[PDB]
Design an enzyme around this catalytic site. Structure first.
Site, mmCIF file in Angstrom:
data_model
loop_
_atom_site.group_PDB
_atom_site.id
_atom_site.type_symbol
_atom_site.label_atom_id
_atom_site.label_comp_id
_atom_site.label_asym_id
_atom_site.label_seq_id
_atom_site.Cartn_x
_atom_site.Cartn_y
_atom_site.Cartn_z
ATOM 1 C CD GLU A 86 -8.462 -2.818 -16.027
ATOM 2 O OE1 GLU A 86 -9.408 -2.041 -15.744
ATOM 3 O OE2 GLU A 86 -7.433 -2.458 -16.639
ATOM 4 C CE1 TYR A 87 -3.033 -10.096 -13.635
ATOM 5 C CE2 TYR A 87 -2.741 -10.353 -15.999
ATOM 6 C CZ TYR A 87 -2.248 -10.461 -14.713
ATOM 7 O OH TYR A 87 -0.970 -10.937 -14.501
ATOM 8 C CG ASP A 131 -5.802 3.860 1.231
ATOM 9 O OD1 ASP A 131 -6.612 4.640 1.806
ATOM 10 O OD2 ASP A 131 -4.865 3.292 1.832
ATOM 11 C CG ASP A 149 -9.107 2.883 -2.730
ATOM 12 O OD1 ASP A 149 -8.169 3.018 -1.927
ATOM 13 O OD2 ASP A 149 -10.246 3.354 -2.528
HETATM 14 O O1 LIG Z 1 2.751 -9.796 -8.039
HETATM 15 C C1 LIG Z 1 2.523 -9.688 -9.275
HETATM 16 O O2 LIG Z 1 3.388 -10.050 -10.114
HETATM 17 C C2 LIG Z 1 1.220 -9.148 -9.752
HETATM 18 C C3 LIG Z 1 0.393 -8.421 -8.901
HETATM 19 C C4 LIG Z 1 -0.826 -7.933 -9.356
HETATM 20 C C5 LIG Z 1 -1.216 -8.167 -10.669
HETATM 21 N N1 LIG Z 1 -2.459 -7.676 -11.196
HETATM 22 C C6 LIG Z 1 -3.619 -7.312 -10.433
HETATM 23 N N2 LIG Z 1 -4.734 -7.036 -11.128
HETATM 24 C C7 LIG Z 1 -5.869 -6.693 -10.500
HETATM 25 C C8 LIG Z 1 -5.853 -6.630 -9.108
HETATM 26 C C9 LIG Z 1 -4.687 -6.914 -8.387
HETATM 27 N N3 LIG Z 1 -4.694 -6.840 -6.945
HETATM 28 C C10 LIG Z 1 -3.494 -6.724 -6.156
HETATM 29 C C11 LIG Z 1 -2.652 -7.807 -5.982
HETATM 30 C C12 LIG Z 1 -1.496 -7.673 -5.219
HETATM 31 C C13 LIG Z 1 -1.178 -6.456 -4.626
HETATM 32 C C14 LIG Z 1 -2.014 -5.368 -4.793
HETATM 33 C C15 LIG Z 1 -3.160 -5.514 -5.551
HETATM 34 BR BR1 LIG Z 1 -4.285 -3.963 -5.762
HETATM 35 N N4 LIG Z 1 -3.583 -7.254 -9.090
HETATM 36 C C16 LIG Z 1 -0.385 -8.887 -11.514
HETATM 37 C C17 LIG Z 1 0.827 -9.380 -11.058
#
Ligand SMILES: O=C(O)c1ccc(Nc2nccc(Nc3ccccc3Br)n2)cc1
Length: 264
Positions: A86-87, A131, A149
């Protein structure tokens, strides 16, 4: 059905981990946006984790909650495992905590409700030890909070100051001390999150690992003068050397100070 990488358009990397990156992505027909976790799996061998992951993605596959990030599906090609995710548009609570430098009791107690619900759901599903430190927590469509997590740590290029050595601040004494853990692990974390929410730093922060350990195991932590006492009560109750003395998630959600300032 069965996906493969060619079904997806790939955008920027949202975060980059040690076993791979999470990319912005969309299914090609629907043009529907998601997040694609990419795992190198040659790095997985070393770390010793493959097949135990291949069971998880099934255990996570079954998990449906608004405050948990849903794993849509998974596939692999040769050299990579791909988690279809999921985003979460608004990113990490960690960037936010950097922005505002700290939260208020409405924001906090609301997030805490959201987390407590996820954990409680997780528990009923027999899933423990998430976490929940801020870097693994994401922000969904409007305000909502999502536990990511799962896969192994991804960040979003930034700051770069406190990195890992962000490690044990959220680790409970029993975990650090080389003992097993029951479901109670997660209420320790909960207590550390709340503190960081209001304070802006975690209660055990220190320049050396061993000193951080000192305060954790000895449960040595103070409050700045601005912290309401209902906060104090909740945190104090949450952070106990004895897992037993810690609340079940109910009384957390039932807590006077929670109920007061919680938007949910
Ligand atoms: O940096 C930004 O603007 C930014 C960072 C994340 C997202 N969205 C998103 N969706 C699903 C999974 C996911 N993993 C993730 C990515 C980075 C750190 C922690 C995780 Br957990 N990140 C949108 C923008």
């Amino acid at each position: 059905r069965q996906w493969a990488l060619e079904d997806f358009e790939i955008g920027r990397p949202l975060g980059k981990g040690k076993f791979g990156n999470v990319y912005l992505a969309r299914e090609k027909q629907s043009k529907f946006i998601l997040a694609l976790k990419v795992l190198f799996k040659a790095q997985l061998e070393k770390a010793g984790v493959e097949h135990q992951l291949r069971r998880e993605v099934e255990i996570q596959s079954h998990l449906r909650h608004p405050n948990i990030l849903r794993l849509y599906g998974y596939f692999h090609d040769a050299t990579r495992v791909y988690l279809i995710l999921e985003y979460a548009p608004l990113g990490t609570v960690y960037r936010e905590l950097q922005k505002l430098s700290k939260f208020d009791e409405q924001r906090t107690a609301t997030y805490i409700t959201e987390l407590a619900n996820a954990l409680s759901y997780c528990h009923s599903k027999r899933v423990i030890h998430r976490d929940i430190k801020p870097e693994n927590l994401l922000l969904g469509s409007a305000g909502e909070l999502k536990i990511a997590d799962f896969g192994w740590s991804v960040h979003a290029p930034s700051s770069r100051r406190d990195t890992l050595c962000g490690t044990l601040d959220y680790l409970p004494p029993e975990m650090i001390e080389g003992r097993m853990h029951d479901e109670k692990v997660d209420l320790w974390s909960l207590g550390v999150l709340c503190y960081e929410f209001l304070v802006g730093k975690p209660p055990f922060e220190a320049n050396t690992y061993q000193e951080t350990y000192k305060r954790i195991s000895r449960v040595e932590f103070t409050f700045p003068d601005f912290v309401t006492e209902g906060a104090r009560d909740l945190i104090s109750r949450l952070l106990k050397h004895n897992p037993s003395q810690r609340p079940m998630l109910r009384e957390v959600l039932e807590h006077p100070w929670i109920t007061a300032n919680s938007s949910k």
